Amino acid sequence: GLFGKLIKKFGRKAISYAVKKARGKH
């Protein structure tokens, strides 16, 4: 899937930020 590539490109920074946000909004 394209998502896999996108994610590759980020280096799971999207996931990291998602988790960070969802364990620390502000």
Method: NMR
Matching residue, tokens 């364990």:
23
Matching residue, tokens 């998502």:
3
Look at the chain and count its residues.
26
State how far the Cα of 12 lies from the Cα of 23, in Å rounded to an integer.
16
State how far the Cα of 9 lies from the Cα of 12, in Å rounded to an integer.
8
Matching residue, tokens 């590539």:
5
Asked if 10 contacts 2 with a C-beta cutoff of 8 angstroms, the reply is no
Q: Which domain holds residue 19?
A: 1-26
Domain total in the chain: 1
